[PDB]
């Protein structure tokens, strides 16, 4: 592992960040002082959920809660393939992270994000309560249930 960390090959270190993510070694990746890994995540954060989650962990441990709430909220409003329940977790985290002070950011900007995440989380829970009840309902034909699961187990719908 010395030979690994003693390298200056950049495509290599990118390939190793991806490999650590694959194997699940949050142990060793979260323990890198470097910003090089943060910058690498900032480009692909809004591309994949698993990468965004890593980026948000780096922000939170650095008391940058508002920036994580921003990543999580945009990810919940996006058209990436994300389940409704995963979008409930993202909003719930963003709601908490925007409710606490982050230095350098105005109280107004925090509250406006904590409010957008609170409303979207309220709608998401309604949608989850619906989807669950509809799937379990004995009086609903199977043919329709599959159709319900397609349109409700994804991005959050209007009221």
């Amino acid at each position: 592992y010395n030979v690994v960390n003693d390298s200056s090959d950049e495509v290599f270190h990118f390939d190793m960040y991806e490999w650590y993510i694959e194997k699940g070694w949050t142990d060793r990746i979260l323990s890198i002082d470097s910003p090089h890994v943060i910058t690498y995540l900032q480009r692909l954060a809004e591309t994949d959920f698993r990468h965004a989650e890593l980026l948000c962990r780096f922000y939170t441990t650095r008391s940058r809660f508002f920036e994580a709430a921003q990543v999580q909220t945009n990810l919940a409003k996006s058209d990436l393939n994300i389940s409704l329940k995963d979008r409930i977790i993202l909003l719930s985290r963003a709601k908490g992270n925007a409710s606490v002070n982050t230095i350098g950011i105005s109280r107004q900007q925090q509250q406006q994000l904590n409010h957008e995440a609170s409303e979207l989380l309220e709608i998401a829970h309604i949608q989850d309560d619906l989807l669950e009840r509809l799937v379990a309902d004995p009086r609903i034909p199977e043919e329709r249930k599959a159709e319900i699961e397609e349109f409700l187990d994804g991005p959050i719908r209007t009221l």
Binding site: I140, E143, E147, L159
Partner: peptide, 17 residues
């Protein structure tokens, strides 16, 4: 923003196509 429209929906109790 909510807008009720009972007019044209999709029969929740009938399959598609």
């Amino acid at each position: 923003k909510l807008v009720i429209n009972k007019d044209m929906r999709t029969d929740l109790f009938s399959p598609p196509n």
